[PDB]
């Protein structure tokens with residue numbers, strides 16, 4: 076299957092991440108894309124193409140315009156204000172705050188952020204646009220008839236909500252892809268988020284919408300980032316009623332348990348009548364992942380891809396998280412092997 | 417006039433503050449208390465006493481119990497979790513999040529925080545309790561008939577809301593003092609916050625209460641910390657209808673303008689019928705303050721103290737912010753000279 080990948084991911088090469096009270100090099104760094112690309116090619120997925128560029132048509136249907144405007148100028152404004160580090164939010168509109176949007180960069184960066192560990196750096200916006208473009212071109216391949224494609228997105232997307240960045244994410248690539256599929260003629264689409272972390276940004280975007288079903292398997296938010304969404308009770312509101320399905324799971328979860336949640340999520344998606352599934356693929360579910368507490372093995376990713384593809388509807392696989400260890404590439408490639416086999 | 421001050425402020429000696437995307441030495445440093453104490457003594461206010469210790473009776477009436485429990489153990493839990501830096505929140509319950517409280521330290525520190533620049537460090541809880549005690553003992557002096565007293569609080573308090581820390585603050589000393597005055601028999605009290613920054617914590621505590629009038633003069637939150645409260649439209653809710661009065665002001669504001677808002681706030685307090693006024697005194701309104709944009713001069717603080725005391729009701733002055741230069745002490749002492757003269 077075709078792999079869509081932009082070298083412009085490298086424009087996001089942030090120096091710092093706030094982790095454990097320290098400013099350290101970020102987990103979500105360019106070497107991840109290098110490792111994943113090499114592994115997918117090694118596994119025989121060597122039909123790699125750059126995305127065409129895209130403007131904001133599709134993304135404006137899932138993200139707020141003010142938010143996108145903010146991201147486009149955030150770095151320039153931060154630098155113009157004289158700050159010496161990267162652009163890191165510290166004040167946030169938490170409980171019982173005004174809904175008003177500040178005018179300055181310090182206030183706006185907090186207004187538009189859900190998670191302060193993620194610094195905005197020079198090139199971040201351009202990189203995010205390239206990653207979005209990979210998702211859009213992957214979606215277009217599915218819309219045009221392919222049954223599988225892989226968008227090697229970096230930066231990742233699933234923590235970016237309607238109007239907030241965080242969790243290493245700026246533009247919700249999977250949400251843009253789902254929207255693209257709707258725009259190309261689908262009436263019903265599902266996003267299945269198998270990254271270790273809850274896709275709170277994706278959930279937010281579609282929570283009141285009934286055209287896109289959102290399912291996520293993830294570490295229990297009571298004890299895992301993103302901490303403030305992803306409970307099983309969240310099933311949707313309004314037009315979105317019954318089209319969010321969260322499967323929080325605990326420490327040490329192995330495939331024998333995780334796979335039961337996968338089966339159930341696919342039942343839900345099939346009952347909803349999805350015409351295609353956008354898979355938000357993070358491999359931070361791996362037993363060696365440095366920031367995560369599930370215990371999937373490399374062979375389990377083959378099983379995972381096979382099971383998702385046995386839905387018998389077309390798949391767009393969209394890269395999310397997975398850190399640290401050389402096996403992030405093997406693990407991604409293994410999902411694709413399961414899909415293609 | 418009596419000055420209440422605890423040497424246990426020095427138990428809060430954090431190494432880091434997130435400012436401009438860097439971890440820098442904190443502005444709210446122990447040497448502040450040293451500078452202020454020395455200047456007030458130099459001005460003739462040498463009746464300095466340590467507070468008696470206090471338990472949680474008063475403070476539980478203004479802060480949430482879970483919040484206080486969290487502060488008590490935060491440092492220990494952070495350290496036990498293996499993190500190498502000081503305890504700094506990054507994920508926050510912002511727009512459209514679950515209201516649930518996480519169970520782990522990573523989730524809880526965000527749940528209970530409004531502002532990530534403020535690190536929890538060893539000794540912080542102990543220091544915050546001593547600062548609260550200084551406010552309580554000051555309040556007790558006013559309750560017993562003194563017309564003025566100064567509680568040299570450090571850490572400051574006015575950004576600590578019902579259940580969140582931030583802005584260098586953990587326990588809202590001024591709120592605790594106001595509550596103490598009610599408990600000792602007052603029916604109506606006012607808090608007048610003249611620190612450059614909006615007392616969003618104080619506002620939060622009393623927003624739905626009609627027993628404590630809250631007035632604040634501050635940099636406009638559209639372009640100043642705390643960014644998400646302090647607009648003039650916020651006048652109260654429920655039982656608190658009409659008993660919050662915010663006076664946001666812009667860049668370069670001098671006393672000729674600032675003092676007009678002071679006059680108005682005192683008119684409102686008098687119409688409310690406050691039996692005493694707790695003054696949240698920050699001197700970060702000074703023209704040299706490193707993080708603030710007002711242009712008060714050292715002589716203006718004498719005028720300020722005189723005007724507030726011309727209310728003819730008892731005053732408890734509670735220390736808040738004011739940074740960078742040893743003249744913070746002169747400026748505080750000048751307010752006290754205006755009160756005492």
Ligand SMILES: NCCCCCCC(=O)NO
Nearest residue numbers: 192242270272300357396
């Ligand atoms: N402070 C911990 C931040 C963790 C962010 C994890 C983001 C991630 O990998 N999402 O898939």
Ligand SMILES: NCCCCCCC(=O)NO
Nearest residue numbers: 533583611613641698737
């Ligand atoms: N990133 C700027 C944080 C500013 C905190 C100021 C808190 C303060 O001085 N309050 O009175």
Ligand SMILES: [K+]
Nearest residue numbers: 268270272292
């Ligand atoms: K997930």
Ligand SMILES: [K+]
Nearest residue numbers: 609611613633
């Ligand atoms: K103020």
Ligand SMILES: [N+]
Nearest residue numbers: 281284287318
């Ligand atoms: N949905």
Ligand SMILES: [N+]
Nearest residue numbers: 622628656659
């Ligand atoms: N109030």
Ligand SMILES: [Zn+2]
Nearest residue numbers: 270272357396
């Ligand atoms: Zn993840």
Ligand SMILES: [Zn+2]
Nearest residue numbers: 611613700737
């Ligand atoms: Zn201040």
